[PDB]
Amino acid sequence: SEFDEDAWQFLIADYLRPEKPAFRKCYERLELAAREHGWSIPSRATAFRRIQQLDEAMVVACREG
DNA sequence: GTTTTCGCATTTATCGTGAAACGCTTTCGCGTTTTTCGTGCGCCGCTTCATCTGATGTGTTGTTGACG
């Protein structure tokens, strides 16, 4: 997996927000940003896969209260 | 000459990826539903007509009489 760290970081930054947008819309939006910066994005499946690879703790980390 | 290892080939397995399929929950969309809100009228009970309406005390002003 060799892709723009900026895009990956952008997506993670968006998911960990208490807003927690839909993975599909956040991803499409990410595609728009990637279009603007010319970033090469990975497959949605791989992205979600790695989101699974982070931690369960991340889900509470986002919406913690 | 008999066995064992080494080099090459074909077939199958699987991954990583990307676009994709399903299934769950969430909403909104429209036809038919349910309650509340006004407008509306009619009835009943109570009440008056068979006979009903104005003052006082104190202060100020004006006029008239008396006095100079």
Swiss-Prot record:
Ranges for region 1-gamma, viral genome ends binding: 1-65
Residue ranges flagged as DNA-binding region: 1-19
Subcellular location, record wording: Host cytoplasm
Coiled coil: none
Upregulating conditions: Expressed in the early phase of the viral replicative cycle. Expression of early genes is repressed by viral Repc (latency) and favored by viral Ner protein.
Domain of life, source organism: Viruses
Further remark: This enzyme is structurally similar to and performs the same endonucleotidic reaction as retroviral integrases, RNase H, RuvC holliday resolvases and RAG proteins.
Domain notes: The catalytic domain contains two distinct activities, the cleavage and strand transfer activity and the flaps endonuclease activity. The N-terminal HTH Mu-type domain 1-alpha is responsible for sequence-specific DNA binding to the IAS. Two adjacent regions 1-beta and 1-gamma bind to the ends of the viral genome. Contains a D-x(n)-D-x(35)-E motif, named for the conserved glutamic acid and aspartic acid residues and the invariant 35 amino acid spacing between the second and third acidic residues. These residues coordinate the metal ions required for nucleophile activation. Each acidic residue of the D,D(35)E motif is independently essential for the 3'-processing and strand transfer activities.
Assembly: Homotetramer. Part of the transpososome complex composed of a DDE-recombinase A tetramer synapsing the ends of the viral genome and the enhancer element. Interacts with target DNA activator B; this interaction brings DDE-recombinase A to the transposition target site. Interacts with host ClpX; this interaction remodels the transpososome for replication and is required for the flaps endonuclease activity of DDE-recombinase A.
Protein family per UniProt: Belongs to the mulikevirus repressor c protein family.
Record function comment: Responsible for viral genome integration into the host chromosome. During integration of the incoming virus, DDE-recombinase A cleaves both viral DNA ends and the resulting 3'-OH perform a nucleophilic attack of the host DNA. The 5' flanking DNA attached to the ends of the viral genome (flaps) are resected by the DDE-recombinase A endonuclease activity, with the help of host chaperone ClpX. The gaps created in the host chromosome by the viral genome insertion are repaired by the host primary machinery for double-strand break repair.
Protein name: DDE-recombinase A
Organism for this UniProt entry: Escherichia phage Mu (Bacteriophage Mu)
Taxonomic placement: Viruses, Duplodnaviria, Heunggongvirae, Uroviricota, Caudoviricetes
Gene that this sequence comes from: A
